[PDB]
Amino acid sequence: LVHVASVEKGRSYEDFQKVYNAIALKLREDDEYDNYIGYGPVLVRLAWHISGTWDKHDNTGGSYGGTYRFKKEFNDPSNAGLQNGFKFLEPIHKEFPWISSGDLFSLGGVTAVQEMQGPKIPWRCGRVDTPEDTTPDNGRLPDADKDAGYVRTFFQRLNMNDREVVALMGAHALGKTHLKNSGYEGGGANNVFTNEFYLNLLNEDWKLEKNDANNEQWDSKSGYMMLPTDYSLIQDPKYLSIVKEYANDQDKFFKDFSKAFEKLLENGITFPKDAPSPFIFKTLEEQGL
Numbered sequence: 379l380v381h382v383a384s385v386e387k388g389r390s391y392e393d394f395q396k397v398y399n400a401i402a403l404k405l406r407e408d409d410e411y412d413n414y415i416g417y418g419p420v421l422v423r424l425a426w427h428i429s430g431t432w433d434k435h436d437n438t439g440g441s442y443g444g445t446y447r448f449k450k451e452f453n454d455p456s457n458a459g460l461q462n463g464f465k466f467l468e469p470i471h472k473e474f475p476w477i478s479s480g481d482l483f484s485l486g487g488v489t490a491v492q493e494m495q496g497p498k499i500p501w502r503c504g505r506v507d508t509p510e511d512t513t514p515d516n517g518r519l520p521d522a523d524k525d526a527g528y529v530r531t532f533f534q535r536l537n538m539n540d541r542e543v544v545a546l547m548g549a550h551a552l553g554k555t556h557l558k559n560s561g562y563e564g565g566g567a568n569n570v571f572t573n574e575f576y577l578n579l580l581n582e583d584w585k586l587e588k589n590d591a592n593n594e595q596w597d598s599k600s601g602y603m604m605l606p607t608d609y610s611l612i613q614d615p616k617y618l619s620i621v622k623e624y625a626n627d628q629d630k631f632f633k634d635f636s637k638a639f640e641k642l643l644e645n646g647i648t649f650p651k652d653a654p655s656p657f658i659f660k661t662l663e664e665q666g667l
């Protein structure tokens with residue numbers, strides 16, 4: 379399968395900056411969501427889940443087709459809770475009906491990262507909605523109750539290496555788990571993008587406990603939690619080295635996350651040689667808005 383990026387007709391940087399701005403303004407406005415976390419984290423998770431269905435072997439899944447809009451994918455047990463992100467984006471899509479679904483979902487993630495003070499993430503337009511029969515089956519997103527070997531193997535399907543995996547997982551500085559969604563009991567949440575996932579891993583006194591859904595998770599007295607797959611990053615010696623690197627270099631983490639997240643959001647897409655360069659959107663703050 380080949381998915382060729384096709385620019386929404388006549389659109390350019392300014393059009394997409396307007397969409398970015400609408401998302402960013404709504405992120406600022408709707409501040410009460412999820413006990414005042416806001417919609418930032420769920421939008422990042424949405425962008426990842428619509429991308430993380432990709433399979434490098436046959437180019438099925440991925441962000442291109444915007445298939446999360448279809449019931450099979452929308453109702454994936456792995457996507458429980460993301461409906462909130464979709465509902466957030468609905469009025470945005472209504473205001474800008476010309477943007478494709480894949481472009482909107484991925485741009486939501488970029489906007490959220492940047493507005494939460496994370497790194498700039500270059501972003502490319504041109505995802506094109508594909509039909510319902512192109513929706514990937516459930517079961518392509520990762521389990522959280524597994525070890526480092528599982529994580530490593532899983533991410534090979536997305537063409538991610540050890541550094542890319544550890545960098546991407548840094549997004550777990552954001553938001554929280556919700557028992558009703560995933561069977562994991564949320565701890566201290568955050569809506570500012572930093573390298574504190576790695577600092578928490580290395581510095582907290584972690585205890586392996588069972589939550590009210592009878593699943594194991596790692597908890598600290600300070601009120602933080604880690605999934606078994608999160609904690610696996612300090613159990614595996616190769617992942618541990620990289621965790622230490624990012625814990626000690628905020629800029630390096632930002633740069634590596636930016637590259638890995640763009641790659642994740644672009645997997646499966648063929649960009650014509652004369653396609654526009656990636657866009658780097660200004661934050662509301664940078665615009666004085």
Ligand code: HEM
Nearest residue numbers: 419420422423426520521522546549553554555556559560
């Ligand atoms: C082994 C890989 C991963 C596993 C097993 C995993 C699992 C989970 C689980 C179980 C939750 C809780 C969902 C809920 O209860 O609402 C969660 C939340 C989240 N995940 Fe991951 N995740 C992984 C990788 C990633 C990646 C690569 C990203 C983005 C780069 C990401 C971004 C997020 C964000 C931002 C949240 C917070 C959502 C919210 O607060 O509503 N995760 N993850």
